[PDB]
Design a protein around this ligand. Structure first.
Ligand SMILES: CCCCCCCC/C=C\CCCCCCCC(=O)O[C@@H](COC(=O)CCCCCCCCCCCCCCC)COP(=O)([O-])OCC[N+](C)(C)C
Ligand SMILES: CCCCCCCC/C=C\CCCCCCCC(=O)O[C@@H](COC(=O)CCCCCCCCCCCCCCC)COP(=O)([O-])OCC[N+](C)(C)C
Ligand SMILES: CCCCCCCC/C=C\CCCCCCCC(=O)O[C@@H](COC(=O)CCCCCCCCCCCCCCC)COP(=O)([O-])OCC[N+](C)(C)C
Ligand SMILES: CCCCCCCC/C=C\CCCCCCCC(=O)O[C@@H](COC(=O)CCCCCCCCCCCCCCC)COP(=O)([O-])OCC[N+](C)(C)C
Ligand SMILES: CCCCCCCC/C=C\CCCCCCCC(=O)O[C@@H](COC(=O)CCCCCCCCCCCCCCC)COP(=O)([O-])OCC[N+](C)(C)C
Ligand SMILES: CCCCCCCC/C=C\CCCCCCCC(=O)O[C@@H](COC(=O)CCCCCCCCCCCCCCC)COP(=O)([O-])OCC[N+](C)(C)C
Ligand SMILES: CCCCCCCC/C=C\CCCCCCCC(=O)O[C@@H](COC(=O)CCCCCCCCCCCCCCC)COP(=O)([O-])OCC[N+](C)(C)C
Ligand SMILES: CCCCCCCC/C=C\CCCCCCCC(=O)O[C@@H](COC(=O)CCCCCCCCCCCCCCC)COP(=O)([O-])OCC[N+](C)(C)C
Ligand SMILES: CCCCCCCC/C=C\CCCCCCCC(=O)O[C@@H](COC(=O)CCCCCCCCCCCCCCC)COP(=O)([O-])OCC[N+](C)(C)C
Ligand SMILES: CCCCCCCC/C=C\CCCCCCCC(=O)O[C@@H](COC(=O)CCCCCCCCCCCCCCC)COP(=O)([O-])OCC[N+](C)(C)C
Ligand SMILES: CCCCCCCC/C=C\CCCCCCCC(=O)O[C@@H](COC(=O)CCCCCCCCCCCCCCC)COP(=O)([O-])OCC[N+](C)(C)C
Ligand SMILES: Nc1ncnc2c1ncn2[C@@H]1O[C@H](COP(=O)(O)OP(=O)(O)OP(=O)(O)O)[C@@H](O)[C@H]1O
Ligand SMILES: Nc1ncnc2c1ncn2[C@@H]1O[C@H](COP(=O)(O)OP(=O)(O)OP(=O)(O)O)[C@@H](O)[C@H]1O
Ligand SMILES: [Ca+2]
Ligand SMILES: [Zn+2]
Ligand SMILES: [Zn+2]
Lengths: 546, 145, 48
C-alpha cells in the first residue's frame, strides 16, 4: 500500500482500443516535471478553451483529431514555458533575461496597463474647459492638489512603456504557438492532402496564397518540430508528379538531400552576429510577419499601442483603453459577442426598419406634411418634411427613438379632414416601427446573449454527463458510487492521454513496448483509432466485474 | 437596532416592513434574484459606466454646446463643461431616459455636426438604453425565473 | 417560434434518416456512421 500511495501521482493509466479489438489498459509513468508543466494556470486555461470550442462546435469523429492537435499545441506551449522558466556576450544574455521577464510577466503587465488606463481616465474625469487660459477654448485639469497633471504625464509615459512591454511579451510568448500551428497545418496539408502538388488552393484561400512563400524557404519547418517534412513530401509526391518539380516547389536540392542521407559532418556557424543578420531568411521572415500582422490578438495589441501613442497627442484617446475590461472578463466579452452573433439578421432587420420608415416618410411627405412644423415660432417655421432627405432623417432619428411613435413629435390630427388617416398612420408607425421591429432588434441581441450563456452552461453540463473519450454517459457509470468520477479520473483522463503522448515522445523507440509501439505507429499514421469509442474496460468485462 | 432607533426617530420603524419580504417565499426569491447573478450585474453595470464614459468623452470634446439645459438666456447651465458634471449628467439622466441622451440635449438641426450627433444619439439610445439596460433587466428577471 | 421551427428542421434531418427514420444514435456506433447511411445507403437523391 505504501509504494502504491507514493507512486499514485506518477502511475498514469489510460485504456486503448488495441489490435485485438479489445479495450486494454496501459500503465505508463507520468514525470513529475510533466505533471508540474500540466498544472500551471496557463495550460489549464488552454485546456479550458479547447474543451469549450470542441464541445460547442461538435463533431464526434473530429473530436479525437482536435484533441491530438491540442495535445501537440500544449506540449509546445510547455516547451515555451520550460525555455522561459526562471559586448555581445553580456548583451545577449541580458537581452534574453529581459525578454524572459516580459514573457513570464505578460499577464501582470496586461493588468498593470489596465490599471494605468483606469488611473489616467480617473484623472481625466477632472478635466474642464474655459474661454480663458488655464473664440478660443482651453482644456485644463482643475485640481486643488496640483499633482494630478505631473501624475497624468508620468502615467501616460508609463502606460505607453507598458504597451511596448506587452507587445514584446506577446511576441515572445503567444506568437511562437501561432507559428507552430501554422507550420503544423501547412506540413499536414502537404504530407496528406498534397494541395500544392495536386489541388492548388483558390483565390478564397488567402491563407494558402500567403503560405506559398514558405514553400521554398529553407526555414519552412522551423517552428514546427518535424524537420524532414520536405523529404516526406518528396517521398509521397514527385515520384508520380515530378521529383525535380517538387524539389523546386520545396526549395531543396536533390544532391543536398543525398549528401545528408550519406554520412556527413556538420560544420560550425561563423562567429559573430553580423553573419547572422546576413543569414536571416528574408522570405520566411516576411511570411512570419504576415501571419502575425493578421493574428487578431496581436492586432488588438497594436491598436492598443496606437491608442496609447494618440494619448500623447490628446489625453482623451486613453479612454479607448477602458474596453480592455470587456476584452478581459468573460460575460462582458459575451455581451460584445452577442452584438455580432446574429449580425447578418440584425443588419437586414435594421434594413427592414429603414425601408418601412422610408415608406412612412413617402406617405408623410405626399400627405401629412403640414404636421411637421417643430418650431413653436409663428414667424419662423421648421417644417421637417418639406424635403425627402430631411423627413427621412427626422423619422429614422426621432420617431424610432420615441416610444409612442411619430405622433409624439407631430402636430395633433384634430379638426382636420385627414384625422383618421393620421390616426391610422401614427398607430401603424407606433406598432410596426416601435412596438415590433425595435423589440425584434432587442430580441436578436438579448436572445443572442442568452444563447451564448446557455452554450457555456451546456458545455459545462455536457462534460459532467459524458466521458470526453469513450462518450459513454454518466448513467452507466453512476451505478457504482462515484462511478463517473473514477472513470473520468483514473480510467479515461484527458491529461493521462497527454502524458502518454509525452511518454511516447521522450521514450526511445527501441524501448516502446508492444502497446506503446502500436500507439506510436497509430499516431504517426494519424488514424486515431486507439482511442476507445463507445466502449471501455468496464463495458468489456461487465460480467467479470472488471 | 432599528427598533431602538425608532425611539430616536419614529420613521426608523419603516425598516421593519422588509420583514414581509423575509417572511413570504417568492418575495424572498425576488430579493435573492438581485444577487443570484450579482457578479454579472456588477460587471455589466461597470460596462454601462464605461460606455457612458466613452459617450461623455465624445460629447465633451465635441457636442458640448448642446447641453445648455437652462432655458434662460442670461444664465446658462452647460452640463458638459466639466467632465465630472457631464459624466453625472449622462449616467443619471440619459440612462433613465427611454430615448437616450437626445431627449435631453439640444436638437442637432442647422449645424455642421448634424449627422455626427444623429449617429451619437442613435448609438447611445441603442447600446446604453435598448441593449445594456435590458441586459440588466434580463440578468435579474431571468434570475427570478 | 418560426425561427425555432427552421432550426428544428435542420436539426431533425441531421438526427434521423429521412427514409428509414432510424436516428443517428444507432449509426454513430461506427465512426462516420450516419454520414455513410445518409449518403451511400439511403440518400434521397439516389431514390430520385
Ligand atoms: C465610476 C467612476 C466614478 C468615480 C468618481 C469619483 C469622484 C471623486 C470626487 C472627488 C471630489 C474632490 C473634491 O471635491 O476636491 C477637489 C479636488 O480634490 C481632488 O480631486 C482630491 C483627489 C481625490 C483622489 C482620490 C483617489 C483615490 C484612489 C475639487 O474637486 P471637484 O470640484 O469635486 O472636481 C473638479 C473636476 N471637475 C472640474 C471636472 C468638476
Ligand atoms: C514585413 C511585412 C509583413 C506584412 C504582411 C501582411 C500580409 C497580409 C496578407 C497575408 C496575411 C496572412 C494570410 O494568409 O491572410 C490572413 C488575412 O489577410 C488579409 O486579410 C490581408 C489584409 C489570414 O487569412 P484569412 O483572412 O483567415 O483567410 C480566410 C478569410 N477570407 C476568405 C475572407 C480571406
Ligand atoms: C473593436 C472590436 C471588438 C474587439 C475585437 O474583435 O478586436 C480585434 C482587434 O481589434 C482592433 O483591431 C480594434 C479596432 C478598433 C476600432 C476603433 C478605434 C477607436 C476609435 C477612435 C477614433 C479616433 C481582435 O480581437 P479578438 O481576437 O476578438 O480579442 C483577442 C483577445 N484579447 C483582447 C484578450 C487579446
Ligand atoms: C514610440 C515607441 C515607444 C516605446 C515605449 C516608450 C515610451 C515612452 C515615450 C513615448 C513616446 C514619446 C511621448 C512623449 C512626448 O512628448 O510625446 C509627444 C509626441 O506625441 C506623439 O507620440 C505624437 C502623436 C502620435 C503619433 C503616433 C500615433 C499614431 C500615428 C497615426 C495613427 C493612425 C491610425 C492608423 C494607422 C496605425 C507628445 O506631444 P504632442 O503634442 O503629441 O507632439 C506634437 C505632435 N505633432 C508633431 C503631431 C504636432
Ligand atoms: C471607444 C471610444 C474610443 C475613442 C476615444 C477618443 C475620444 C475623443 C478624444 C478626442 C479626439 C479629438 C481631439 O481632441 O482631437 C485632437 C487630437 O487629434 C486628433 O484627433 C487626430 C486624429 C486622430 C485619429 C485617430 C485614429 C485612430 C485609429 C486607430 C487604428 C489602429 C489600428 C492598428 C492596427 C494594428 C486635436 O489635437 P489636440 O490633441 O487637441 O492638439 C492640442 C494638444 N493638447 C490638447 C494636448 C494641448
Ligand atoms: C440613423 C438612424 C438610426 C435609427 C435606427 C437605429 C436602430 C438600431 C440599429 C442598429 C444597427 C446596429 C448594427 C450592428 C452591426 C454589428 C456588426 C455585424 O452585423 O456583424 C456581422 C457582419 O456581417 C454582416 O452582417 C454582413 C454584412 C456586413 C454588415 C456590416 C455592419 C457594419 C455596422 C457598422 C457579423 O455577421 P456573422 O459573423 O455572419 O454573424 C454570425 C456570427 N457567428 C458565426 C459567430 C454565429
Ligand atoms: C375626419 O375626422 O375624418 C374625415 C374622413 O376620414 C376618412 O376618410 C377616414 C377613412 C377611414 C380611415 C380608417 C380605415 C382603415 C382602418 C385600418 C385598416 C388597416 C372627415 O373629415 P371632416 O369631418 O370633413 O373634417 C373637417 C375638416 N375641416 C374642419 C378642416 C373643415
Ligand atoms: C434597551 C433594551 C430594551 C428591552 C426591551 C424593553 C423595551 C421598552 C423600553 C425601550 C427603551 C426605552 C424607550 C423609551 C424612551 O423614552 O426612549 C428614549 C431613548 O431612545 C433611545 O433608545 C435612544 C436612541 C437609540 C439609541 C440606541 C440605538 C442604537 C445605537 C446606535 C446604533 C448604530 C448601528 C450600528 C451598531 C449596532 C426615546 O427618546 P429619545 O428622544 O430618543 O432620547 C434622547 C436621545 N439622545 C440622548 C441620543 C439625544
Ligand atoms: C429600507 C429603509 C430603512 C430606513 C428607514 C429610515 C428612513 C429615514 C428615517 C429618518 C432618519 C433621519 C432623521 O430623521 O434623523 C433623525 C434621527 O437621527 C438619525 O438619523 C441618527 C443616525 C442613525 C443611524 C442609523 C444607522 C443604522 C445602522 C443599523 C445597523 C445594524 C447592525 C446590527 C448588527 C447585529 C435626527 O434626529 P431626530 O430623531 O429628528 O431628533 C428629534 C427627535 N424627534 C423627531 C422624535 C422629536
Ligand atoms: C449613478 C448613476 C447610475 C445609473 C445607472 C444605473 C443602472 C442600474 C444599476 C444597477 C446596479 C445594482 C447593483 C446590484 C448589486 C447587488 C449585490 C451583488 O452584486 O451581490 C454580489 C456581490 O458579489 C460581487 O458581485 C462581487 C463584487 C462586489 C460587488 C458589491 C456590490 C455592492 C452594491 C452596492 C453577489 O455575488 P455572488 O454571490 O457571487 O452571486 C452568485 C449567487 N449564487 C452563488 C447564489 C448563485
Ligand atoms: C450636416 O448636415 O452634415 C454635415 C456633414 O456631415 C458629416 O460629415 C456626416 C458624415 C457621416 C456621418 C455618418 C457616418 C457613419 C454611419 C454609421 C456608422 C456606424 C454638413 O454640414 P453643413 O451642411 O455644412 O452644415 C451647415 C452649418 N451651418 C448652417 C451652421 C453653417
Ligand atoms: N475523459 C475525461 N477526462 C476528464 N474529465 C472528464 C472526462 N470525461 C468527462 N469529464 C468531466 O470533466 C470534468 C473536469 O473537471 P476537472 O476538475 O478535472 O477539471 P477543470 O477544473 O474543469 O479544468 P480546467 O480548469 O482546465 O477548466 C470532470 O470532473 C468530469 O466531470
Ligand atoms: N436519407 C437521407 N438522405 C439525405 N440526407 C439525409 C438523409 N437522412 C438524413 N439526412 C441528412 O440530410 C443532410 C443533407 O445535407 P447535404 O449536404 O447532403 O445537403 P444540403 O446541403 O442540406 O441540401 P440543400 O442545399 O438542398 O438544402 C445530410 O448531411 C444528413 O445529415
Ligand atoms: Ca525494444
Ligand atoms: Zn471513458
Ligand atoms: Zn436510412
Amino acid at each position: 500500500e505504501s509504494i502504491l500511495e507514493y507512486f499514485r501521482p506518477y502511475l498514469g493509466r489510460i485504456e486503448i482500443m488495441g489490435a485485438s479489438r479489445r479495450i486494454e489498459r496501459i500503465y505508463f509513468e507520468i514525470s513529475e516535471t510533466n505533471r508540474a508543466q500540466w498544472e500551471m494556470p496557463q495550460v489549464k486555461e488552454s485546456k479550458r478553451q479547447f474543451i469549450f470550442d470542441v464541445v460547442n462546435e461538435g463533431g464526434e469523429a473530429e473530436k479525437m483529431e482536435l484533441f491530438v492537435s491540442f495535445c501537440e499545441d500544449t506540449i509546445f506551449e510547455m516547451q515555451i514555458a520550460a525555455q522561459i522558466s526562471e559586448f555581445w556576450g553580456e548583451l545577449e544574455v541580458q537581452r534574453v533575461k529581459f525578454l524572459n521577464y516580459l514573457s513570464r510577466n505578460f499577464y501582470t503587465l496586461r493588468f498593470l496597463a489596465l490599471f494605468l488606463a483606469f488611473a489616467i481616465n480617473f484623472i481625466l474625469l477632472f478635466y474642464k474647459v474655459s474661454d480663458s487660459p488655464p473664440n478660443m477654448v482651453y482644456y485644463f485639469l482643475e485640481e486643488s492638489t496640483g499633482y494630478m497633471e505631473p501624475a497624468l504625464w508620468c502615467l501616460s509615459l508609463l502606460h505607453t512603456l507598458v504597451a511596448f512591454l506587452c507587445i514584446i511579451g506577446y511576441n515572445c510568448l503567444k506568437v511562437p504557438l501561432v507559428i507552430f500551428k501554422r507550420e503544423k497545418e501547412l506540413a499536414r496539408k502537404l504530407e496528406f492532402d498534397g494541395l500544392y502538388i495536386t489541388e492548388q488552393p483558390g483565390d478564397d484561400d488567402v491563407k494558402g496564397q500567403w503560405d506559398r512563400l514558405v514553400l521554398n524557404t529553407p526555414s519552412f519547418p522551423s517552428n514546427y518540430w518535424d524537420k524532414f517534412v520536405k523529404r516526406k513530401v518528396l517521398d509521397k509526391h514527385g515520384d508520380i508528379f515530378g521529383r525535380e518539380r517538387i524539389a523546386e516547389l520545396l526549395g531543396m536540392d536533390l544532391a543536398s538531400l543525398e549528401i545528408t542521407a550519406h554520412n556527413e559532418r556538420k560544420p560550425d556557424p561563423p562567429p559573430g552576429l553580423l553573419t547572422w543578420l546576413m543569414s536571416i531568411d528574408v522570405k520566411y521572415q516576411i511570411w512570419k510577419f504576415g501571419v502575425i500582422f493578421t493574428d487578431n490578438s496581436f492586432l488588438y495589441l497594436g491598436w492598443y499601442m496606437v491608442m496609447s501613442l494618440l494619448g500623447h497627442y490628446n489625453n482623451f484617446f486613453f479612454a479607448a483603453h477602458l474596453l480592455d475590461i470587456a476584452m478581459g472578463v468573460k460575460t462582458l466579452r459575451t455581451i460584445l459577442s452577442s452584438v455580432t452573433h446574429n449580425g447578418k439578421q440584425l443588419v437586414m432587420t435594421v434594413g427592414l426598419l429603414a425601408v418601412v420608415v422610408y415608406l412612412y416618410t413617402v406617405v408623410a411627405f405626399n400627405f401629412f406634411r403640414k404636421f411637421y412644423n417643430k418650431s413653436e415660432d409663428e414667424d419662423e417655421p421648421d417644417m421637417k418634411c418639406d424635403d425627402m432627405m430631411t423627413c427621412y432623417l427626422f423619422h429614422m432619428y426621432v420617431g424610432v427613438r420615441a416610444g409612442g411613435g411619430i405622433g409624439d413629435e407631430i402636430e395633433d390630427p384634430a379638426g382636420d379632414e385627414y384625422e383618421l388617416y393620421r390616426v391610422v398612420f401614427d398607430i401603424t408607425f407606433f406598432f410596426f416601427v416601435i412596438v415590433i421591429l425595435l423589440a425584434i432588434i432587442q430580441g436578436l441581441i438579448i436572445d443572442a446573449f442568452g444563447e451564448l450563456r446557455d452554450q457555456q452552461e451546456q458545455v459545462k453540463e455536457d462534460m459532467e454527463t459524458k466521458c470526453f473519450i469513450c462518450g459513454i454517459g454518466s448513467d452507466y457509470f453512476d451505478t457504482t458510487p462515484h462511478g463517473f468520477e473514477t472513470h473520468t479520473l483514473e480510467e479515461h483522463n484527458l491529461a493521462n492521454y497527454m502524458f502518454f503522448l509525452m511518454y511516447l515522445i521522450n521514450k526511445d523507440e527501441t524501448e516502446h513496448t508492444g502497446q506503446e509501439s502500436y500507439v506510436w505507429k497509430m499516431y504517426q499514421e494519424r488514424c486515431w483509432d486507439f482511442f476507445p469509442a463507445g466502449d471501455c474496460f468496464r463495458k468489456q468485462y461487465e460480467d467479470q466485474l472488471s
